[PDB]
């Protein structure tokens, strides 16, 4: 059933699984009209579909044209997400298809189950973890490819860069979720931590800076402080 | 007006006939039920005094044969049997009537309740849900499971209701996933009505039969079927106007007849709130909504 703190190591076993996060699929800016009413303008979005064992990220860019002439867009966005995840699964070779898909929001369960009826042996699961995948658009290279898209497009990334050469997928996921939690809690400060030092760069083929093991410990400590700090500034403690 | 004689009443039992019921004491000189209205199916049902576990009973139509009840002390229940010797039967009934050993089906003349609850229920369709072809009547009890329940175990003792499953390939056209799930009209009208039931009368007959088995036997899978068939209509944006008007009448009389004290177990909060207040047909069931609001406002 649901994925929680108790069964956390299951993410890193050898059963292929994907997280699906839909929180950036339907994105809008809210603005005033000439008549003083309020309207929305959609901007490009993305489905965040991640293998937590390997780091492979299937970033399906949702171009604003998919909303043209449609009603009830927040509802449609869940079904469009499910359509695109189903299409991704069908595109994969059988031996690459996931055994389980974990949706980060419970409102994705019925849309994805219905789209995956042809795959009765793929488990569709919720999670009780509060994962920070909404902050994916705070990763500059992901935001850039989403905002530049002029048409629907799928772009493949490894969200762990080359970390798995040195650390396990449990540690890599822990680092990713810490980075994304920080970016979600205070994006400016988080990005200051990551890029303050000009001598540590981001490789062309990477998303994050090329930190040594020791620098990652410093970075990770700074991110924890930020999250505790912001938690301080928030609740006054 | 037809008769179902009893050989005897050797164990104390509450006997139901349709929506009526009466207590018979152990070895009380009771020899059956007369004046049963011709033209409707009927159900005669039993709850033993010493073991209220297992309500059981028999659906029958007196036009199809001469039926009687006889207790079996081996299997421990009142069984329905068919008497093929017409003259023996008539002679038995006449003797029991002369000695006034029968209760009379107690129908008030103004009262259309039983018609209204069985309007679309036919014995031939009952016999396909309840498979026991050597008999003209059909046994049902509290514990029998449905074909769908068994999928999720003795098949010969199953209720073969039509399987309805809103998240199934039958319900969902490839490429119409969102459309068909949020508006079930193609599943209702094409798959179920045109395809399986052939017409709305047969759909309503199975819906009414499911309700009656839920109410009279506390049969849980029958209650699931009744609610599924209601929800499938309410969740369709496109339903023939005559079906909506008839459904309102059907449900009105079901809600009216339900024991007030069984509402907690026989009525599904989610389905009824969804059907009356959220669904496409939230404004199409005026009679049902009014009786539900006045009789079971807690459920809502
Ligand atoms: C090697 C993982 C680096 O990142 C983390 O550890 C995240 C901050 S989660 C966390 N667990 N326990 C903590 N005290 S902080």
From Swiss-Prot, chain A:
This protein's superkingdom?
Eukaryota
Please state where this protein is localized: Nucleus
Signal peptide start-end: none
Q: Which region ranges are annotated with the description RNase H homology domain?
A: 7-237
The free-text domain remark for this protein reads: The MPN (JAB/Mov34) domain has structural similarity with deubiquitinating enzymes, but lacks the residues that would bind the catalytic metal ion.
What's in the misc comment field? Present with 468 molecules/cell in log phase SD medium.
Subunit text: Component of the U4/U6-U5 tri-snRNP complex composed of the U4, U6 and U5 snRNAs and at least PRP3, PRP4, PRP6, PRP8, PRP18, PRP31, PRP38, SNU13, SNU23, SNU66, SNU114, SPP381, SMB1, SMD1, SMD2, SMD3, SMX2, SMX3, LSM2, LSM3, LSM4, LSM5, LSM6, LSM7, LSM8, BRR2 and DIB1.
Biological function = Functions as a scaffold that mediates the ordered assembly of spliceosomal proteins and snRNAs. Required for association of BRR2 with the spliceosomal U5 snRNP, and the subsequent assembly of the U4/U6-U5 tri-snRNP complex. Functions as a scaffold that positions spliceosomal U2, U5 and U6 snRNAs at splice sites on pre-mRNA substrates, so that splicing can occur. Interacts with both the 5' and the 3' splice site, as well as the branch region. Has a role in branch site-3' splice site selection. Associates with the branch site-3' splice 3'-exon region. Also has a role in cell cycle.
Q: What is this protein called?
A: Pre-mRNA-splicing factor 8
Record organism: Saccharomyces cerevisiae (strain ATCC 204508 / S288c) (Baker's yeast)
- Name of encoding gene: PRP8
UniProtKB/Swiss-Prot annotation, chain B:
Q: Which keywords does UniProt give here?
A: Cytoplasm, mRNA processing, mRNA splicing, Nucleus, Phosphoprotein
Pfam families per the record? AAR2, AAR2_1st
After translation, the protein is modified as follows: Phosphorylated on serine and tyrosine residues.
Q: Which GO terms describe its biological process?
A: spliceosomal snRNP assembly; spliceosomal tri-snRNP complex assembly
Question: Could you give one GO CC term from the UniProt record?
Answer: cytoplasm
Could you tell me which residues belong to the region Leucine-zipper?
244-265
Write down which residues bear the modification named Phosphoserine. 236
* Transmembrane regions: none
Q: Which residues carry this modification: Phosphothreonine?
A: 257
Protein's cellular compartments: Cytoplasm; Nucleus
The protein's predominant localisation is cytoplasm
Additional note from the record: Present with 7330 molecules/cell in log phase SD medium.
Q: What does this protein do?
A: Component of the U5 snRNP complex that is required for spliceosome assembly and for pre-mRNA splicing. Involved in splicing pre-mRNA of the A1 cistron and other genes that are important for cell growth.
What assembly does the database describe for this protein?
A: Heterodimer. Interacts with PRP8 (via RNase H homology domain and MPN domain), competing with BRR2 for the same binding site. Component of a U5 snRNP complex that contains at least the U5 snRNA, PRP8, SNU114, AAR2, SMB1, SMD1, SMD2, SMD3, SME1, SMX2 and SMX3, but is not a component of the U4/U6-U5 tri-snRNP complex.
The family annotation for this protein states: Belongs to the AAR2 family.
The record's PANTHER family line, in alphabetical order, gives: A1 CISTRON SPLICING FACTOR AAR2-RELATED (PTHR12689), PROTEIN AAR2 HOMOLOG (PTHR12689:SF4)
Can you say what this protein is called? A1 cistron-splicing factor AAR2
């Amino acid at each position: 059933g649901a994925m929680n703190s108790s069964n956390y190591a299951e993410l890193f076993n050898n059963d292929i699984k994907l997280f699906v996060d839909d929180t950036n699929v339907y994105r809008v800016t809210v603005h005033k009209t000439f008549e003083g009413n309020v309207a929305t303008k959609a901007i490009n979005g993305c489905i965040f579909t991640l293998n937590p064992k390997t780091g492979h990220l299937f970033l399906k860019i949702i171009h604003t044209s998919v909303w043209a002439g449609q009603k009830r867009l927040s509802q449609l966005a869940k079904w469009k997400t499910a359509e695109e995840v189903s299409a991704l699964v069908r595109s994969l070779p059988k031996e690459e298809q996931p055994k389980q898909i974990i949706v980060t929001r419970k409102a994705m369960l019925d849309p994805l189950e219905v789209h995956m009826l042809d795959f009765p042996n793929i488990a569709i699961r919720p999670t009780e973890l509060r994962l920070p995948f909404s902050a994916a658009m705070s990763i500059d290279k992901l935001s850039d490819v989403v905002m530049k898209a002029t048409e629907p497009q799928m772009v493949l990334f490894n969200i762990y860069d080359d970390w798995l050469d040195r650390i396990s997928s449990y540690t890599a996921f822990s680092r990713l979720t810490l980075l994304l939690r920080a970016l979600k809690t205070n994006e400016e400060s988080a990005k200051m931590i990551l890029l303050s030092d000009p001598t540590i760069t981001i490789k062309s083929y990477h998303l994050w800076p090329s930190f040594t093991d020791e620098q990652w410990i410093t970075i990770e400590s700074q991110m924890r402080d930020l999250i505790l700090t912001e938690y301080g500034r928030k609740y006054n403690v | 007006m037809n008769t179902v004689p009893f050989t005897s009443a050797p164990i104390e039992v509450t006997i139901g006939i349709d929506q009526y019921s009466f207590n018979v004491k152990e070895n009380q000189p009771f020899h059956g039920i007369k004046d049963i209205p011709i033209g409707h199916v009927h159900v005669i049902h039993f709850q033993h005094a010493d073991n209220s576990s297992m309500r059981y009973g028999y659906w029958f139509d007196c036009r199809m044969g001469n039926f009687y009840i006889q207790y079996d002390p081996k299997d421990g229940l009142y069984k329905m049997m068919e008497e093929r010797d017409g003259a023996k039967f008539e002679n038995i009934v006449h003797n029991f009537k002369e000695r006034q050993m029968m209760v009379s089906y107690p129908k008030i003349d103004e009262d259309d309740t039983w018609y209204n609850l069985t309007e679309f229920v036919q014995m031939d369709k009952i016999r396909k849900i309840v498979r026991k072809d050597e008999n003209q009547f059909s046994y049902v009890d509290s514990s029998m499971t449905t074909v769908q329940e068994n999928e999720l175990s003795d098949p010969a003792h199953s209720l073969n209701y039509t399987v309805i499953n809103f998240k199934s390939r039958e319900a969902i056209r490839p490429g119409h996933e969102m459309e068909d799930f949020l508006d079930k009209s193609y599943y209702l009208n094409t798959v179920m009505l045109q395809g399986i039931f052939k017409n709305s009368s047969n759909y309503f007959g199975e819906l009414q039969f499911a309700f009656l088995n839920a109410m009279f036997f506390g049969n849980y899978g029958s209650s699931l079927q009744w609610h599924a068939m209601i929800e499938l209509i309410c969740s369709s944006a496109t339903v023939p106007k005559h079906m909506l008007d008839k459904l309102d009448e059907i449900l009105y009389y079901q809600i009216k007849t339900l024991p007030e004290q069984y509402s907690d177990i026989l009525l599904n909060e989610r389905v009824w709130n969804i059907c009356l207040y959220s669904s496409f047909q939230k404004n199409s069931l005026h009679n049902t909504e009014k009786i539900m609001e006045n009789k079971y406002p807690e459920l809502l």
